[PDB]
Design a protein around this ligand. Sequence first.
Ligand SMILES: CCCCCCCCCCCCCCCCCC(=O)OC[C@H](COP(=O)(O)OCCN)OC(=O)CCCCCCCCCCCCCCCCC
Ligand SMILES: NC(=O)C1=CN([C@@H]2O[C@H](COP(=O)(O)OP(=O)(O)OC[C@H]3O[C@@H](n4cnc5c(N)ncnc54)[C@H](OP(=O)(O)O)[C@@H]3O)[C@@H](O)[C@H]2O)C=CC1
Ligand SMILES: CCCCCCCCCCC1=C(C)C(=O)C(OC)=C(OC)C1=O
Ligand code: SF4
Ligand code: SF4
Ligand code: SF4
Ligand SMILES: [Zn+2]
Lengths: 114, 208, 297, 156, 146, 95, 48, 176
Amino acid sequence: TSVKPIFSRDMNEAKRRVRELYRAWYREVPNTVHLFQLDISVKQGRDKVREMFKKNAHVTDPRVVDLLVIKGKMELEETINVWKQRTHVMRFFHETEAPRPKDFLSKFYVGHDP
Amino acid sequence: TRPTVRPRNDVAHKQLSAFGEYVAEILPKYVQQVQVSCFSELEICIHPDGVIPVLTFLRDHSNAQFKSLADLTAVDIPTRQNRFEIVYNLLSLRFNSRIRVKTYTDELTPVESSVSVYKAANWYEREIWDMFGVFFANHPDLRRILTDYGFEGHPFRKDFPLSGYVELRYDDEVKRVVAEPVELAQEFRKFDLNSPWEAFPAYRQPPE
Amino acid sequence: LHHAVIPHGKGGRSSVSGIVATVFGATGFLGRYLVNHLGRMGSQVIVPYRCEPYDTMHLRPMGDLGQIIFMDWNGRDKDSIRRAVEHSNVVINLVGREWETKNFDFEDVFVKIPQAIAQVSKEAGVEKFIHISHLNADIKSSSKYLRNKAVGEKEVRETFPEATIIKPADIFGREDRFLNYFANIRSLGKKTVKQPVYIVDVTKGIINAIKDPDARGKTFAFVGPNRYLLFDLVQYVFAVAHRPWTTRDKVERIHTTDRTLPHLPGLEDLGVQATPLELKAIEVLRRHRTVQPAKTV
Amino acid sequence: SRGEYVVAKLDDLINWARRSSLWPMTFGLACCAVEMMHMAAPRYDMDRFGVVFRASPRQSDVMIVAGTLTNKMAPALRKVYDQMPEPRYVVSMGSCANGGGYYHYSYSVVRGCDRIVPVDIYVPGCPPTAEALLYGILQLQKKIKREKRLRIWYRR
Amino acid sequence: FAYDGLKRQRLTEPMVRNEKGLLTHTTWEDALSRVAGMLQSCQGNDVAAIAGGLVDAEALIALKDLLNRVDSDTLCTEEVFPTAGAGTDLRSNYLLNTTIAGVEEADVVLLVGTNPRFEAPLFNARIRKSWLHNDLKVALIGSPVD
Amino acid sequence: GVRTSPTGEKVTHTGQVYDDEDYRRVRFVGRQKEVNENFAIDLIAEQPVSQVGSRVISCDGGGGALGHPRVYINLDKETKTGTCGYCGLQFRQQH
Amino acid sequence: PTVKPPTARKFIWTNHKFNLSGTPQQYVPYSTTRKKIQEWVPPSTPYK
Amino acid sequence: TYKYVNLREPSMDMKSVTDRAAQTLLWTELIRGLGMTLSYLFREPATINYPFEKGPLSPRFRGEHALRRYPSGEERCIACKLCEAVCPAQAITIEAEPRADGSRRTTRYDIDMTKCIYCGFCQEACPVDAIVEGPNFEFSTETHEELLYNKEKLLNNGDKWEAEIAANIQADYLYR
Ligand SMILES: CCCCCCCCCCCCCCCCCC(=O)OC[C@H](COP(=O)(O)OCCN)OC(=O)CCCCCCCCCCCCCCCCC
Ligand SMILES: NC(=O)C1=CN([C@@H]2O[C@H](COP(=O)(O)OP(=O)(O)OC[C@H]3O[C@@H](n4cnc5c(N)ncnc54)[C@H](OP(=O)(O)O)[C@@H]3O)[C@@H](O)[C@H]2O)C=CC1
Ligand SMILES: CCCCCCCCCCC1=C(C)C(=O)C(OC)=C(OC)C1=O
Ligand code: SF4
Ligand code: SF4
Ligand code: SF4
Ligand SMILES: [Zn+2]
């Protein structure tokens, strides 16, 4: 249980890196909506950033959230520099996908998936 | 066994065994196994803290001069707790030989980057990041190199499916190539080809 | 219910939706997005086309292999209509014109061809027929469009009594002739009140009318969330477009206000959230670029 | 009558001009680029059909998709297709552009370019020979030859 | 070899009785609503359930919990087991309590009222293996079957 | 030996035909259902039974290495001919 | 084939057809197998 | 066992210096290149007159697939599924049952020609010469599903091309 760290010795430094990455994304979202000329609003993209950060809000391992900050910086670097196109940025917004059945009964109606 | 059997190179086998002893006793801090295959290839199996000392030794020693990094490779073996096997294929032009340097990591422990030893490694270990998720610490520009820009997961892991999780198509409504969950019109038909009879008695693993 | 038309899959491109649709008028503005949203479910779409097959190319990336069948048809030919509808379980009628031509006037486009399609679908055992009227269709209207379209609504109802007649108000989208008309007109301001509706809302409503068995024999009125005056709507279009082919029938229809029929169901009785103009006006009018939102009533 | 005759002969003129002056843009993605380059080599010689080699992508008529379309170059494919002036046609060359090919079950390959662009001619092979691609180009020319743009314009 | 009855005669869609009294295909919403409307109008011994031969324990406890929400205990099986005495309270009076593999340990077997060759052919195969290898004495009370 | 359903659709040598109410007949509408009219079960039935005088005969389909693997067919049953498992040619012991 | 003729077979096409793609004689794919699951047909007599 | 490309020191006498200066000022190698291009101007071009002339092929050529028959009309495929076991694209899909005279034959034999890599492993795996890969390469379609061949299309290709397929196998079976 003695493991070699990545960047963070414990979870406080890890949350510091999560917090700085969130600051960087929050600053970037208006530029992304402008230069990719997205059809979303800045508040909507910021809600998507908050959704992506709250998706990983259960992690208690410092190395795992170090890798999450690293991959978030890689996503940010692909978005600031125009390496992604408009399609890669809009793949966060699952727009052409049909709304999946949520409760038991509609999932029972359409098929066999639990 | 003359015409169809590959002839064994005993001279190179003895030479690579002696050089494996040499490398194992110069660097006993990191060298775990040394093994020479039957087709005369030398593998040095090391501890991952000695990526930079072992590779810098093999690059700079007067009896090594492995100046050329041929290939750098991860192999995913999921039954091992250090599932990723980082393989270094080195080439000596002075002594006309090749050496394999092997080490291990799991998904979370980083391997030290070897661009200070071989600048060839810059894209190779970046490909290892892209395909396996093995993070290389103190790398100049570590990011993806082969997958698409929004790609989630590491494709050469063996728990990753052959067709992935998303597929693309153009959608005329949003005027945009979109990513939707993957559905095959014909499923990839898995073939259980393995014979129930043992093929190689020399490779028989001992029972429990 | 036959075994090949039972739904399967997770509702994707290679899935089976169990919807076998013949979409008359599928090469137009509404037929584009309807064939789009049908073929992403895995539906067998039948496209009778009048035009050049080059003009149906954009429909081929809209579904899986063998899921869009193209075939020739003529509006005055009942044999081709029968050859198109005899295997479908839903026929959607989208045949329309903003202008009348040498061969097809407003009566042929809105009365003759819709009643012929509905009658031939009736005698071919097609369970569902979905006809598209206009919201402002009235026998006593000043435009020949709306008079013939109200007469065709009447005939489609009395020859296919279980049909789902739908009243879009003024559909706006990328390929519309509502916001693209105002962006290019560079006619005047009057007392007209309109509530335009987004094309994805109309398409989702037509598909939710296909799927809901409670839409048989009904009449829906597809309207947007916000009623606008005509003048500040046009000024909002010129403000979004960063700006400072017509006929008198189109002028009669622009200066005809959208009637409100609360006795008819709408998009919310098909479970569709009506998208306002302020979200999608930039998506429509970004092409016209070389904003305070519009005042509702 | 007379107008049907006039629009028929004008269809014949413009179809002759468009098929006999095809200018191809080539997505030389993979091995099928080598075989299109042999279709432009002196044996088969696309240029004697009016089909110029290394035409400008801005003023090209047919987009020859010759290679494996991956997921990473599908939006660039669609962008080059959207920048083409009409009438634009698409010849899908080879098995990976037709249907995924040898990489059909890959995580990173678009299963045929017809998920991205409308395709007019499907040319089968891995690679199809330069003669087979020239067969597909001549079949595209025959497809243009029987177009009825002004006849359908007159009958509407 | 009975897996080809598994692809014949199958129930593939919900069915209800129409106005003529014939079974016609319908949706799951219509069929489950017509069952639930009659289930809501029942209470006590007005609703019952028979479990057939090929039913898993999940559906068994599902229909048991469902009919107990109506306060109905009338849940039955087709195969009669006597309920006198302990009945089905103790498991030891309705199980093969020894084991199938306990046939190998026995030296005398009494078979009462069964034809275990056809009722349970591999239990009979275990009896024949113990007959052959362990010189098992078997006696039958019943008709003299092979 | 192609036969025809009451819908007019041809039946393949498998026995495949689409039903009257199956929607997938719309793929042949304006086009053709391509069947092969040379049914192999009818063509191999036209070949005469080969009278041979041996108890075991061999068959490789004709052509040596151009046929099928060489198999040996017993002919002890006088009720039934001996049929090749590959090519379907059938044999009878003449005594 | 005027000098060395092809070997005659009774099943070879006597009428060679060219590429029929884009015509009404073109190839349309279909599943050549039959229906796998047979469905229960309910009885057309009443149940009372 | 090695040679030095570009390790020539040029002569610095007045003759060679005047040679190189005449090459610079009078463009001698440029006229050499113009002469080589002019030499190809007066050659007969290598252009064949497709479609009226065809490129040369061998009897080994791997084009369109076809299911063959014995010289009785009986189809050679005995449903053994070696060709879809070896098919590196999994383009082949086979189902089978005993047909009405008890023979081991296929009911499905699909080849997706847009998965197919045209490598001929099916014709070399086939023990009865049933699946072969014929000489047809002029079979471009206008729709994707016209290249998804079922058994009837492959048997029609066999009946269509047998007069040529059998002669190519006759020319090449001794190498196999
Ligand atoms: C009231 C009556 C008049 C009505 C309006 C019509 C006005 C006249 C328009 C021109 C003539 C109309 C017909 C055009 C050609 C139609 C026939 C055709 O396409 O024939 C095909 C034939 C070649 O056959 P192909 O299919 O190419 O086969 C491949 C080779 N084996 O093709 C050929 O052999 C060559 C075809 C040449 C086409 C005509 C010549 C070019 C056009 C000249 C006039 C217009 C341009 C003037 C100058 C413009 C600036 C340079
Ligand atoms: N904003 C809107 O567009 C609104 C539209 N509607 C109604 O919705 C329907 C569809 O609208 P929309 O897509 O925008 O209109 P379009 O004009 O864009 O499309 C009409 C379709 O009908 C076909 N068509 C037209 N005339 C004929 C004819 N005489 N014979 C055969 N086919 C013909 C066209 O095909 P082809 O290219 O071959 O001519 C095209 O596919 C129409 O009935 C329209 O009145 C209602 C409210 C608002
Ligand atoms: C008024 C007459 C107009 C004739 C137009 C001919 C245009 C030239 C055709 C071939 C061609 C050549 C030679 C050419 O040099 C060129 O530039 C690289 C092209 O563009 C890509 C061409 O297409
Ligand atoms: S279809 Fe085959 S040969 Fe052609 S580009 Fe693709 S992989 Fe290469
Ligand atoms: S040629 Fe190769 S890829 Fe094509 S069907 Fe045969 S084995 Fe499969
Ligand atoms: S290998 Fe030959 S005989 Fe075997 S299934 Fe394939 S085509 Fe038929
Ligand atoms: Zn034989």
